A = this chain, B = another copy of it.
Amino acid sequence: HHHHHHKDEVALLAAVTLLGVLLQAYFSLQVISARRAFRVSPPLTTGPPEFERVYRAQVNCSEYFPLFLATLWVAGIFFHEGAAALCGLVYLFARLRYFQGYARSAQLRLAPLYASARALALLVALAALGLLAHFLPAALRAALLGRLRTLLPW
């Protein structure tokens, strides 16, 4: 304390973040369940195709989850919190579908994969635009000022 909080500026990003964590946890329990169904004991991550697909779905989601988080927060802070949260929700939903698809067949992972990549790319673009909005004016001003300069003439 501090007589103000910035919780209000980030609660939706936080809610989507927690939702993402819960979804990852879900994936983990699904991998353990495939480990019982197809009798694959730790360590060792090879087995029947269906296990390898479930396993691999969880691994890919894990690898993308920090990318999602980073961009979600940057976009939400630099561009717009609500838009970022929406894209995040779409992303996470796409990822749930990716995992389910993959579990059934490699080919069925593909449509939700593409959906998830577009949402992520949108998040990136918002992050980039937000950062650009932050930095570009001061930079342009500094460049104009140096040019100015001229002076003691004109």
Copies in the complex: 3
| Contact status of A63 and B62, CB under 8 A, knowing A18-B127, A44-B52 | yes
Chain B hits for A106, CB < 8 A: 41-43
We find that the number of chain A residues with CB closer than 8 angstroms to chain B is: 48
A21–B56 touching, CB < 8 Å = no
B131–A11 touching, CB < 8 Å = yes
Chain B hits for A135, CB < 8 A: 11, 15
| Contact status of A67 and B21, CB under 8 A, knowing A14-B74, A77-B14, A134-B11 | yes
**Residues of chain A at the chain B interface (Cβ within 8 Å):** 1-2, 4, 6-11, 14-15, 17-18, 20-22, 24-25, 41-45, 49, 52-53, 55-56, 59, 62-63, 65-67, 69-71, 74, 77-78, 106, 109, 124, 127-128, 131, 134-135
